[PDB]
């Protein structure tokens, strides 16, 4: 329950977008806080000043109080503190004055990595191995950057990586059954670190190499708790090499410090990417 009378939100001039430039469009979905809608913003592209660029707008849900407002604001402010990187969903601007809070972030035309891969599987009526490694490498770079800015994602998964028209991987919702991505220490002991994100990254690799497969298929969460404690892990995917499988397994060491850093993962993936 929110404070009864706060000040209207202050403007940050350098990020403020004129409302005349923004035109809201079709809903895209809902994340942790608020919803996201498709929109067009004129002048976002500095080189093409008259062109309406498609963007994504974060705004309040239809049934929201202003409790949800502080969350949306916090997110925006985190994105500003974290700064820009190729492999994250970047802040593009905001409308904070004379109407609803609108937070503009980069638009990813091809949806999330899960649905990107699933849609481009061999059945239905060409995705290569290098492409899969490329995806993993790009996600690792994104997480390396975020970790370098003291950012912990807490819900890293293929569903939270977005793919642009140019096939760029972009981590989403880094500002703040998901149990299948949680590290034991996070699941059992509520502990979140960069090293818990690495576990999640390991599960993400598995997603990538099953072409957007759901992890621990056919295993209910109660079983999962037991089999994680017993030290069991997912088996190598079909499309996975031994070296890549070893990287997954290193991500799933029970002891967090024995998991590699994202720095190390980037290097590891780079080697696999370059020899392919
Ligand atoms: C909650 C929402 O949050 C965001 C946050 C920033 C964004 N930037 N860009 C998007 C975005 C843009 C387009 C988009 N869609 C277009 C399509 C999915 C429809 N297909 S199609 C016709 O090409 O087959 C791809 N989905 C998401 C987006 C979504 C979201 C969605 Cl809807 C899907 N997966 C992950 C998340 Cl976190």
PDB file of N, CA and C and ligand atoms in Angstrom, residues 28-31 36 56 58 89 105-112 159-160 162 172-173, ligand 1:
ATOM      1  N   UNK A  28       2.536  -6.519 -25.742  1.00  0.00           N
ATOM      2  CA  UNK A  28       3.484  -7.583 -26.046  1.00  0.00           C
ATOM      3  C   UNK A  28       3.445  -8.645 -24.949  1.00  0.00           C
ATOM      4  N   UNK A  29       3.416  -8.216 -23.685  1.00  0.00           N
ATOM      5  CA  UNK A  29       3.295  -9.152 -22.583  1.00  0.00           C
ATOM      6  C   UNK A  29       3.526  -8.477 -21.237  1.00  0.00           C
ATOM      7  N   UNK A  30       3.600  -9.307 -20.191  1.00  0.00           N
ATOM      8  CA  UNK A  30       3.825  -8.831 -18.838  1.00  0.00           C
ATOM      9  C   UNK A  30       5.048  -9.536 -18.264  1.00  0.00           C
ATOM     10  N   UNK A  31       5.933  -8.757 -17.624  1.00  0.00           N
ATOM     11  CA  UNK A  31       7.078  -9.300 -16.917  1.00  0.00           C
ATOM     12  C   UNK A  31       6.808  -9.269 -15.417  1.00  0.00           C
ATOM     13  N   UNK A  36       4.529  -4.586 -20.974  1.00  0.00           N
ATOM     14  CA  UNK A  36       5.281  -4.051 -22.092  1.00  0.00           C
ATOM     15  C   UNK A  36       4.359  -3.975 -23.304  1.00  0.00           C
ATOM     16  N   UNK A  56       9.970  -0.781 -27.451  1.00  0.00           N
ATOM     17  CA  UNK A  56       9.116  -1.381 -26.441  1.00  0.00           C
ATOM     18  C   UNK A  56       8.955  -0.396 -25.288  1.00  0.00           C
ATOM     19  N   UNK A  58       7.655   0.101 -21.377  1.00  0.00           N
ATOM     20  CA  UNK A  58       7.256  -0.447 -20.093  1.00  0.00           C
ATOM     21  C   UNK A  58       6.359   0.569 -19.403  1.00  0.00           C
ATOM     22  N   UNK A  89      18.993  -5.415 -23.145  1.00  0.00           N
ATOM     23  CA  UNK A  89      17.918  -4.526 -23.551  1.00  0.00           C
ATOM     24  C   UNK A  89      18.152  -3.164 -22.898  1.00  0.00           C
ATOM     25  N   UNK A 105      12.489   1.015 -24.087  1.00  0.00           N
ATOM     26  CA  UNK A 105      13.652   0.146 -24.174  1.00  0.00           C
ATOM     27  C   UNK A 105      13.667  -0.492 -25.560  1.00  0.00           C
ATOM     28  N   UNK A 106      14.807  -1.108 -25.898  1.00  0.00           N
ATOM     29  CA  UNK A 106      15.050  -1.637 -27.232  1.00  0.00           C
ATOM     30  C   UNK A 106      14.026  -2.718 -27.573  1.00  0.00           C
ATOM     31  N   UNK A 107      13.643  -2.765 -28.853  1.00  0.00           N
ATOM     32  CA  UNK A 107      12.651  -3.703 -29.354  1.00  0.00           C
ATOM     33  C   UNK A 107      13.369  -4.891 -29.987  1.00  0.00           C
ATOM     34  N   UNK A 108      12.900  -6.105 -29.683  1.00  0.00           N
ATOM     35  CA  UNK A 108      13.514  -7.318 -30.198  1.00  0.00           C
ATOM     36  C   UNK A 108      12.501  -8.054 -31.068  1.00  0.00           C
ATOM     37  N   UNK A 109      12.662  -7.921 -32.392  1.00  0.00           N
ATOM     38  CA  UNK A 109      11.623  -8.258 -33.353  1.00  0.00           C
ATOM     39  C   UNK A 109      11.318  -9.755 -33.370  1.00  0.00           C
ATOM     40  N   UNK A 110      12.297 -10.591 -33.005  1.00  0.00           N
ATOM     41  CA  UNK A 110      12.166 -12.030 -33.182  1.00  0.00           C
ATOM     42  C   UNK A 110      11.762 -12.730 -31.883  1.00  0.00           C
ATOM     43  N   UNK A 111      11.398 -11.944 -30.858  1.00  0.00           N
ATOM     44  CA  UNK A 111      10.918 -12.488 -29.599  1.00  0.00           C
ATOM     45  C   UNK A 111      12.071 -12.990 -28.732  1.00  0.00           C
ATOM     46  N   UNK A 112      11.756 -13.894 -27.794  1.00  0.00           N
ATOM     47  CA  UNK A 112      12.757 -14.399 -26.867  1.00  0.00           C
ATOM     48  C   UNK A 112      13.461 -15.612 -27.477  1.00  0.00           C
ATOM     49  N   UNK A 159      13.867 -17.492 -21.960  1.00  0.00           N
ATOM     50  CA  UNK A 159      12.661 -16.688 -22.062  1.00  0.00           C
ATOM     51  C   UNK A 159      12.965 -15.219 -21.764  1.00  0.00           C
ATOM     52  N   UNK A 160      14.076 -14.954 -21.060  1.00  0.00           N
ATOM     53  CA  UNK A 160      14.460 -13.605 -20.669  1.00  0.00           C
ATOM     54  C   UNK A 160      15.661 -13.117 -21.478  1.00  0.00           C
ATOM     55  N   UNK A 162      16.265 -11.818 -25.406  1.00  0.00           N
ATOM     56  CA  UNK A 162      15.512 -11.401 -26.580  1.00  0.00           C
ATOM     57  C   UNK A 162      16.421 -11.355 -27.807  1.00  0.00           C
ATOM     58  N   UNK A 172      17.074  -9.377 -20.961  1.00  0.00           N
ATOM     59  CA  UNK A 172      15.965  -8.525 -20.563  1.00  0.00           C
ATOM     60  C   UNK A 172      15.736  -8.621 -19.055  1.00  0.00           C
ATOM     61  N   UNK A 173      15.031  -7.623 -18.505  1.00  0.00           N
ATOM     62  CA  UNK A 173      14.581  -7.621 -17.120  1.00  0.00           C
ATOM     63  C   UNK A 173      15.743  -7.926 -16.174  1.00  0.00           C
TER      64      UNK A 173
HETATM   65  C1  LIG B   1       7.313  -9.250 -20.833  1.00  0.00           C
HETATM   66  C2  LIG B   1       7.942  -9.013 -22.188  1.00  0.00           C
HETATM   67  O1  LIG B   1       8.923  -7.981 -21.945  1.00  0.00           O
HETATM   68  C3  LIG B   1       9.599  -7.420 -22.997  1.00  0.00           C
HETATM   69  C4  LIG B   1      10.568  -6.481 -22.604  1.00  0.00           C
HETATM   70  C5  LIG B   1      11.344  -5.818 -23.528  1.00  0.00           C
HETATM   71  C6  LIG B   1      11.140  -6.111 -24.878  1.00  0.00           C
HETATM   72  N1  LIG B   1      11.733  -5.645 -26.013  1.00  0.00           N
HETATM   73  N2  LIG B   1      11.210  -6.232 -27.115  1.00  0.00           N
HETATM   74  C7  LIG B   1      10.269  -7.082 -26.718  1.00  0.00           C
HETATM   75  C8  LIG B   1       9.517  -7.860 -27.716  1.00  0.00           C
HETATM   76  C9  LIG B   1       9.294  -7.376 -29.001  1.00  0.00           C
HETATM   77  C10 LIG B   1       8.571  -8.126 -29.905  1.00  0.00           C
HETATM   78  C11 LIG B   1       8.056  -9.356 -29.504  1.00  0.00           C
HETATM   79  N3  LIG B   1       7.320 -10.172 -30.386  1.00  0.00           N
HETATM   80  C12 LIG B   1       7.189 -10.057 -31.849  1.00  0.00           C
HETATM   81  C13 LIG B   1       7.028 -11.604 -31.885  1.00  0.00           C
HETATM   82  C14 LIG B   1       7.161 -11.635 -30.337  1.00  0.00           C
HETATM   83  C15 LIG B   1       5.790 -12.205 -32.589  1.00  0.00           C
HETATM   84  N4  LIG B   1       6.723 -13.081 -33.371  1.00  0.00           N
HETATM   85  S1  LIG B   1       6.622 -13.438 -34.968  1.00  0.00           S
HETATM   86  C16 LIG B   1       5.172 -12.813 -35.746  1.00  0.00           C
HETATM   87  O2  LIG B   1       7.739 -12.800 -35.598  1.00  0.00           O
HETATM   88  O3  LIG B   1       6.511 -14.864 -35.042  1.00  0.00           O
HETATM   89  C17 LIG B   1       7.953 -12.514 -32.731  1.00  0.00           C
HETATM   90  N5  LIG B   1       8.262  -9.841 -28.269  1.00  0.00           N
HETATM   91  C18 LIG B   1       8.976  -9.101 -27.391  1.00  0.00           C
HETATM   92  C19 LIG B   1      10.178  -7.050 -25.294  1.00  0.00           C
HETATM   93  C20 LIG B   1       9.392  -7.714 -24.344  1.00  0.00           C
HETATM   94  C21 LIG B   1       8.519 -10.286 -22.762  1.00  0.00           C
HETATM   95  C22 LIG B   1       7.874 -10.930 -23.813  1.00  0.00           C
HETATM   96 CL1  LIG B   1       6.399 -10.288 -24.468  1.00  0.00          CL
HETATM   97  C23 LIG B   1       8.397 -12.089 -24.342  1.00  0.00           C
HETATM   98  N6  LIG B   1       9.515 -12.647 -23.881  1.00  0.00           N
HETATM   99  C24 LIG B   1      10.148 -12.044 -22.877  1.00  0.00           C
HETATM  100  C25 LIG B   1       9.688 -10.882 -22.294  1.00  0.00           C
HETATM  101 CL2  LIG B   1      10.596 -10.190 -20.984  1.00  0.00          CL
END
